[PDB]
Ligand binder design. Structure first.
Ligand SMILES: [Cl-]
Length: 257
C-alpha cells in the first residue's frame, strides 16, 4: 500500500508479522526489498513495516529534495505502524533514523547498524569534489559508475569488493535508484556527528557494527554509543563480510523486548 507524506508524496510500504511495531529504515541504494529477509525473521515477534524511501521502489518523489521530507516520510510510516514504533536503521538509514529521533518523532526504541559517520582519520578522506562528480556521473546516465564512485570514494570500499558487487544480482537494482545517492549524501551531511542533537536522544538505543567493519566504523559506533546517553554498543557475530538476518535478528529481539 501507500501513505501520503506531508508534502503529498506517496510512500509505499508493506506490513507483516504480529506484535509491537518495528519500522525498518534502509540506507543508500536500498529499497523495501532489502529489509525483507530480516523482516521475515522478526515477524514472529513484531509487526514489521518495510518501506521504499522517496524516489525508490514504488514510492513517488516530490522535488525539491530536503532531509526534512524524508523525516516526514518516516513519520508517515510510523503512523501507518500505529503512531509509534521501534525503529531499526541501516547505514545511512541509521543517520536518517537518528535525525528523526532527535527531531522528536515517536520512536520508542532505536537500533542502528553501521551509521557511516566519521570521527577520525582512519576513514579515507572523501574527495572535496564528491557532490560535483556524483552529479556529473548521474547527468551522463552513468548510473553504474555513480554507484562505484559512491562505494569507493563515498564510503571507502576497496576496488576489489566493489568490482565483485558489480557481478552480483544486487547491482541492477542499485543502478536503478542511483539518482537517490545525493539524497543520502544530504542526510549524512559531511559525515560529522551532530553531537549536541544526538546527546539529546533519551530513548533506549542500540548501536551495532559487524565483524568485518572497517576501523573507522567501529570508532564511530563507539562514539555514538557514548554520546547517546542510554545506548549500548554491540559487535555482531557475522562470520563473513555479509551480515545475514540471523546475525541481527536475535540481538534486535532481545533489545526490543
Ligand atoms: Cl555506468
Amino acid at each position: 500500500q501507500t501513505v501520503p507524506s506531508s508534502d503529498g508524496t506517496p510512500i509505499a510500504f508493506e506490513r507483516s508479522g504480529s506484535g509491537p511495531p518495528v519500522v525498518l529504515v534502509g540506507g543508500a541504494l536500498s529499497t523495501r526489498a532489502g529489509g525483507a529477509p530480516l523482516a521475515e525473521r522478526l515477524a514472529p515477534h513484531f509487526t514489521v513495516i518495510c518501506y521504499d524511501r522517496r524516489g525508490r521502489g514504488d514510492s513517488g518523489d516530490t522535488p525539491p529534495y530536503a532531509v526534512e521530507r524524508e523525516i516526514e516520510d518516516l513519520a508517515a510510516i510510523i503512523d501507518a505502524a500505529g503512531g509509534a514504533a521501534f525503529v531499526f536503521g541501516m547505514s545511512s538509514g541509521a543517520g536518517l533514523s537518528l535525525l528523526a529521533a532527535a527531531s522528536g518523532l515517536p520512536i520508542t526504541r532505536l537500533a542502528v547498524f553501521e551509521p557511516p559517520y566519521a570521527v577520525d582519520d582512519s576513514r579515507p578522506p572523501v574527495p572535496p569534489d564528491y557532490q560535483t562528480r556524483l552529479d556529473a556521473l548521474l547527468a551522463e546516465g552513468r548510473r553504474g559508475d555513480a554507484v562505484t564512485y559512491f562505494m569507493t570514494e563515498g564510503v571507502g570500499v576497496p576496488p576489489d569488493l566493489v568490482a565483485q558487487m558489480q557481478q552480483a544480482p544486487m547491482w541492477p537494482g542499485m543502478e536503478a535508484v542511483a539518482h537517490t545517492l545525493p539524497y543520502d549524501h544530504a542526510v549524512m551531511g559531511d559525515n560529522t556527528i551532530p553531537t549536541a542533537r544526538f546527546a539529546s536522544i533519551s530513548i533506549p538505543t542500540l548501536v551495532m557494527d559487524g565483524g568485518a567493519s572497517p576501523a573507522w566504523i567501529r570508532h564511530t559506533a563507539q562514539e555514538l554509543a557514548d554520546t547517546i546517553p542510554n545506548a549500548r554498543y554491540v559487535t555482531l557475530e557475522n562470520q563473513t563480510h555479509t551480515v545475514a538476518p540471523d546475525a541481527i535478528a536475535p540481538v534486535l529481539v532481545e533489545f526490543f523486548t
